[PDB]
């Protein structure tokens, strides 16, 4: 009865499942599991991750930016930044977005395909006489 | 309208001379950049699927794409929203905010990248919006550039101080 | 026929350094203690006006501040007289700020708890590069040595399509405010272990716990923790030009650099047209 | 007016002496002559 | 990687207008790092042509 979607995941990301925390996550994002900090609990970690992944899957060809995560969800901004980067690493976020739509730096263009001339000192090349044949001799 | 530099060279030169002295001038001279703004939150706002007192009452009783969202069908929709719990409406509002703002940012990204390409072209001296087919015409344009006096520098295409010294096997 | 020692490039002499000192510093390096430096000089004060922000490595014994400042004043195209007059004032200003930078407490005092404590502050930005003004606010935890401001600023400026001026301004602002809080904490008695903040003016600026039901942000606050790039008219531009306490946080309005290409600089230079 | 020149000469000489003592030739070597911790933890796990 | 980033930025940005002096203040303002290393790299580059 509910409407359906279709999304794509890299084959190496099948381990990911909601309602569950994997050891890869525990050893990749160690902050949310050291039992010293009351705010960074695995329960709030699961909520961060679920919010990001769900709101991405609502429209899989729109790049999910950390700016909206920072806008909607309360918490340290660099923690959300690291979580977003980890999610992007293991597929699982912005997989479908067309390249050339991803963000990029605002920099001067590249000048690698340019032709350059060289300024040489005086005695670097010899003086030459004798223009040589360049044609086979008649026999 | 794309770039925002002060358009008159005289005021820039006077500004920089007085700045070299240490004094101010009357006019304002801002730095170069493209025009345009990003007024988020003067824009898409958080939807309020709840009424004013819906959440407190729930507490007392103890309980294709349009912008980013796809289009829904009345019959199948009126069931799903009847299924969900007031504890899950907040999550819904926030997922919808996320998708709306993400689409808006996608659009502004497209626009700004176009404007930055035009800015770099203008600053490098290329006329504007040159295609891969016009390159040689551009070179011909260069000729026109000096004809419209002007004397070219050694930093001018085809005006290098260094010239090729042909080998002996090349005859001419 | 002559013997010419060198040809001046940009009316300057080539820089020649000591390679033994270079290798001595490079082969014994351990850390990269970075100081945020802010230069501000008005005209109805010392004669020149100049504003800039900068990051400087304190564990650096290779470059003399006098050479750096002389080069910088040559970059701004100051006259010879003005440069020779004010290089001393600028050097003293830069030299003071390095000495009062004691450092990062959680490093000089070994804490490094891999998640830090939960001391979180609000970082507020107001950057006026060009004719635009970026205003933003976000939460930042200052106990964690994993938080790197450069990567965060780079990501934000990629996602909003901003030039490098904003990147460096944002990184500098983050570092500046983080250090203001570090300094205000260590100035009073505070051993940076065993949180026990034990104060009133601060502990009122830190952000509360996040337990749960507080992870989602109200709508009235979501408007505050979002970026805005507002373009400003000439009148407000001139107003903003004319006009450790934690109440007032300094804004960033650098004077433009005479560059033909880069955004945020003035175009008083040898034109791209080569005549 | 240009002191680094001296260094160049001396340094060059030194290397040559080394190459002369160990029977090495420095020119036309037939070799190439060219050349955050959290992110590294993550991609190493990957 | 950071070295190539900074170096290519400086060279690309200079070669767009060879008539103008490319200073250390612009590089310091457009790429993020301590000003001392950027000073050293800019001097190396401007020294070798």
Task: Describe this structure in a few short sentences.
Chain A is mainly α. Chain A is built from four helices and no strands.
Describe the structure.
- This is part of a larger assembly, with two copies of chain A, one copy of chain B (172 residues), one copy of chain C (275 residues) and one copy of chain D (46 residues).
- Chain A is mostly helical and 139 residues long.
- Chain A is built from four helices and no strands.
- Chain A has helices at residues 23-28, 42-57, 66-72, 77-89.
- In chain A, helix 2 (42-57) crosses helix 4 (77-89).
- Chain A is elongated and about 95 Å long.
- Chain B is an all-alpha fold and 172 residues long.
- Chain B is 46% helix and 1% strand.
- The longest helix of chain B has 36 residues, at 89-124.
- Chain B starts with 8 loop residues before the first helix and ends in a 25-residue tail after the last helix.
- Chain C has 275 residues and is α+β, with helices and mostly antiparallel strands.
- Chain C has helices at residues 19-26, 65-75, 80-99, 105-108, 149-160, 164-187, 219-222, 234-242, and strands at 34-41, 50-57, 120-127, 132-141, 228-231, 257-258, 265-266.
- Chain C starts with 18 loop residues before the first helix and ends in a 9-residue tail after the last strand.
- The relative contact order of chain C is 0.12.
- By secondary structure, chain D is mainly α.
- Chain D is built from two helices and no strands.
- Chain D is elongated, with a radius of gyration of 21 Å.
- Chain D starts with a helix and ends with a helix.
- Classes of the chains: A mainly alpha (139), B mainly alpha (172), C alpha+beta (275), D mainly alpha (46).
- Chains in contact: A-B, A-C, A-D, A-E, B-C, B-E, C-D, C-E.
- Chains B and C meet through helix 1, strand 1 and helix 4 of B and strand 5, helix 8 and strand 7 of C.
- Strand 1 of chain B pairs antiparallel with strand 5 of chain C.
- It is classed as dna binding protein.
- Keywords: SWI/SNF remodeling, DNA binding protein.
What is the topology?
The structure is cut from a larger assembly and holds two copies of chain A, one copy of chain B (172 residues), one copy of chain C (275 residues) and one copy of chain D (46 residues).
Chain A (H helix, E strand, L loop, with lengths): L22 H6 L13 H16 L8 H7 L4 H13 L50
Helix pairs in contact in A: 2-4
Chain C lengths: L18 H8 L7 E8 L8 E8 L7 H11 L4 H20 L5 H4 L11 E8 L4 E10 L7 H12 L3 H24 L31 H4 L5 E4 L2 H9 L14 E2 L6 E2 L9
Parallel strand pairs in C: 6-7
Antiparallel strand pairs in C: 1-2, 3-4, 4-5
Chain D lengths: L3 H18 L15 H9 L1
Family (chain D): Belongs to the SWI1 family.
Protein name (chain D): SWI/SNF chromatin-remodeling complex subunit SWI1
Subcellular location (chain D): Nucleus
């Amino acid at each position: 009865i509910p409407q359906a979607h279709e999304i794509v995941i890299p084959s190496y990301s099948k381990w990911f499942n909601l309602e569950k925390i994997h050891s890869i996550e525990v050893q990749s994002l160690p902050e949310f599991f050291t039992n010293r900090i009351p705010s960074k609990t695995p329960e709030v970690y699961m909520r961060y991750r679920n919010f990001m992944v769900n709101s991405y899957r609502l429209n899989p060809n729109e790049y999910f930016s950390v700016t909206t995560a920072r806008r909607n969800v309360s918490g340290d901004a660099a923690a959300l930044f690291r979580l977003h980067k980890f999610l992007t690493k293991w597929g699982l976020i912005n997989y479908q977005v067309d390249s050339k739509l991803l963000p990029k730096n605002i920099e001067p263009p590249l000048t690698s395909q340019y032709s350059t001339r060289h300024d040489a000192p005086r005695g670097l090349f010899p003086f030459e006489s004798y223009k040589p044949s360049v044609q086979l001799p008649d026999m | 309208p794309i770039v925002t530099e002060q358009p008159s060279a005289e005021i820039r030169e006077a500004y920089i001379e007085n700045f070299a002295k240490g004094e101010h001038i009357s006019a304002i001279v801002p730095g170069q950049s493209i025009s345009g703004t990003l007024e988020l939150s003067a824009q898409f706002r958080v939807p309020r699927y709840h009424s004013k007192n819906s959440f407190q009452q729930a507490l007392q009783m103890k309980a294709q794409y349009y912008r980013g969202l796809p289009l829904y069908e009345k019959n199948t929709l009126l069931e799903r929203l009847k299924q969900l719990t007031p504890n899950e409406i907040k999550e819904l509002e926030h997922l919808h905010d996320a998708v709306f703002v993400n689409t808006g940012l996608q659009n502004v990204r497209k626009v700004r990248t176009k404007k930055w390409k035009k800015y770099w072209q203008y600053k490098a001296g290329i006329p504007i919006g040159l295609k891969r087919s016009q390159l040689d015409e551009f070179k011909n344009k260069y000729l026109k550039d000096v004809l419209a006096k002007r004397v070219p520098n050694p930093n001018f295409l085809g005006n290098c101080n260094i010239k090729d010294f042909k080998p002996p096997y090349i005859y001419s | 026929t002559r013997v010419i020692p060198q040809v001046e490039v940009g009316n300057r002499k080539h820089y020649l350094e000591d390679k033994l000192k270079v290798y001595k510093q490079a082969m014994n390096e351990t850390s990269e203690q970075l100081v945020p430096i802010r230069l501000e000089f008005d005209q109805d004060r010392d004669r020149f006006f100049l504003r800039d922000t900068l990051l400087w490595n304190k564990n650096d014994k290779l470059i003399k501040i006098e050479d750096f400042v002389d080069d910088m004043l040559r970059d701004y195209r100051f006259e010879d007289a003005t440069r020779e007059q004010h290089i001393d004032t600028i050097c003293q200003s830069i030299q003071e700020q390095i000495q009062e930078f004691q450092g990062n407490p959680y490093i000089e005092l070994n804490q490094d708890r891999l998640g830090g404590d939960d001391l979180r502050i609000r970082i507020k930005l107001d950057i006026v590069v060009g004719q635009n003004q970026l205003i933003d606010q976000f939460e930042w935890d200052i106990s964690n040595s994993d938080n790197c401001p450069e990567e965060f600023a780079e990501s934000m400026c990629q996602e909003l399509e901003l030039p490098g001026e904003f990147v460096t301004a944002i990184a500098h602002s983050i570092r500046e405010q983080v250090h203001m809080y570090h300094k205000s904490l260590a100035l009073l008695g505070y051993n940076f272990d065993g949180s026990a903040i034990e104060d009133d003016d601060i502990r009122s600026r830190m952000l509360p716990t996040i337990t749960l039901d507080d992870v989602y942000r109200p709508a009235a606050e979501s408007k505050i923790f979002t970026p805005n790039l507002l373009q400003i008219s000439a009148a407000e531009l001139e107003r903003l030009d004319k006009d450790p306490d934690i109440a007032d946080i300094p804004r960033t309005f650098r004077t433009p650099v005479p560059s033909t290409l880069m955004p945020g600089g003035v175009d008083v230079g040898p034109s791209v047209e080569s005549y | 007016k240009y002191p680094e020149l001296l260094d160049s000469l001396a340094i060059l000489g030194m290397n040559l002496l080394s190459n002369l003592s160990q029977n090495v030739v420095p020119y036309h070597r037939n070799t190439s002559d060219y050349y955050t911790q959290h992110d590294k933890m993550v991609d190493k796990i990957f």
